[PDB]
Amino acid sequence: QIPASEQETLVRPKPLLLKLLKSVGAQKDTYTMKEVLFYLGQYIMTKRLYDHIVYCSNDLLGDLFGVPSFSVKEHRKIYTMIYRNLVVV
Ligand SMILES: CC[C@@H](CS(=O)(=O)C(C)(C)C)N1C(=O)[C@H](CC(=O)O)O[C@H](c2cccc(Cl)c2)[C@H]1c1ccc(Cl)cc1
């Protein structure tokens, strides 16, 4: 029960989120939430942090989100953790 519109939001990552995104995607100043979620998704799968829990205490992603692990099924929490690392444009 998250709206579809949320993936349209325009955002400006803070430096550490930007560092992580640069490892998987082109470097722009502005991203859609859709893009951010995809890049983070690819980052996680590429680095195999996920086998419904993502484990990230041995990874920069852990520092980014402030948790050692999280559930992929809890989307509102994920959006919340993402939002602390960006500015809405
Ligand atoms: C790395 C985990 C990826 C995998 S996936 O969708 O890309 C695929 C099934 C294609 C392999 N992921 C999920 O597995 C879960 C699947 C689900 O529980 O519905 O969806 C995650 C998702 C999608 C959209 C928004 C949010 Cl906040 C999270 C989504 C996700 C979780 C965390 C982050 Cl940071 C980004 C995307």
Swiss-Prot record:
Region ranges (Necessary for interaction with USP2): 1-89
All residue ranges annotated as the SWIB/MDM2 domain in the record: 9-88
Residue numbers spanned by region Sufficient to promote the mitochondrial pathway of apoptosis: 1-80
Transmembrane segments: none
Induction: By DNA damage.
Modified how: Phosphorylated at multiple sites near the RING domain by ATM upon DNA damage; this promotes its ubiquitination and degradation, preventing p53/TP53 degradation.
Quaternary structure annotation from Swiss-Prot or TrEMBL: Interacts with p53/TP53, TP73/p73, RBL5 and RP11. Binds specifically to RNA. Can interact with RB1, E1A-associated protein EP300 and the E2F1 transcription factor. Forms a ternary complex with p53/TP53 and WWOX. Interacts with CDKN2AIP, RFWD3, USP7, PYHIN1, and RBBP6. Interacts with ARRB1 and ARRB2. Interacts with PSMA3. Found in a trimeric complex with MDM2, MDM4 and USP2. Interacts with USP2 (via N-terminus and C-terminus). Interacts with MDM4. Part of a complex with MDM2, DAXX, RASSF1 and USP7. Part of a complex with DAXX, MDM2 and USP7. Interacts directly with DAXX and USP7. (Microbial infection) Interacts with herpes virus 8 protein v-IRF4.
Domains: entry comment: Region I is sufficient for binding p53 and inhibiting its G1 arrest and apoptosis functions. It also binds p73 and E2F1. Region II contains most of a central acidic region required for interaction with ribosomal protein L5 and a putative C4-type zinc finger. The RING finger domain which coordinates two molecules of zinc interacts specifically with RNA whether or not zinc is present and mediates the heterooligomerization with MDM4. It is also essential for its ubiquitin ligase E3 activity toward p53 and itself.
Family: Belongs to the MDM2/MDM4 family.
Summary of the function given for this chain in its UniProt record: E3 ubiquitin-protein ligase that mediates ubiquitination of p53/TP53, leading to its degradation by the proteasome. Inhibits p53/TP53- and p73/TP73-mediated cell cycle arrest and apoptosis by binding its transcriptional activation domain. Also acts as a ubiquitin ligase E3 toward itself and ARRB1. Permits the nuclear export of p53/TP53. Promotes proteasome-dependent ubiquitin-independent degradation of retinoblastoma RB1 protein. Inhibits DAXX-mediated apoptosis by inducing its ubiquitination and degradation. Component of the TRIM28/KAP1-MDM2-p53/TP53 complex involved in stabilizing p53/TP53.
Note from the entry: MDM2 RING finger mutations that failed to ubiquitinate p53 in vitro did not target p53 for degradation when expressed in cells.
Protein name per the record: E3 ubiquitin-protein ligase Mdm2
The encoding gene: MDM2
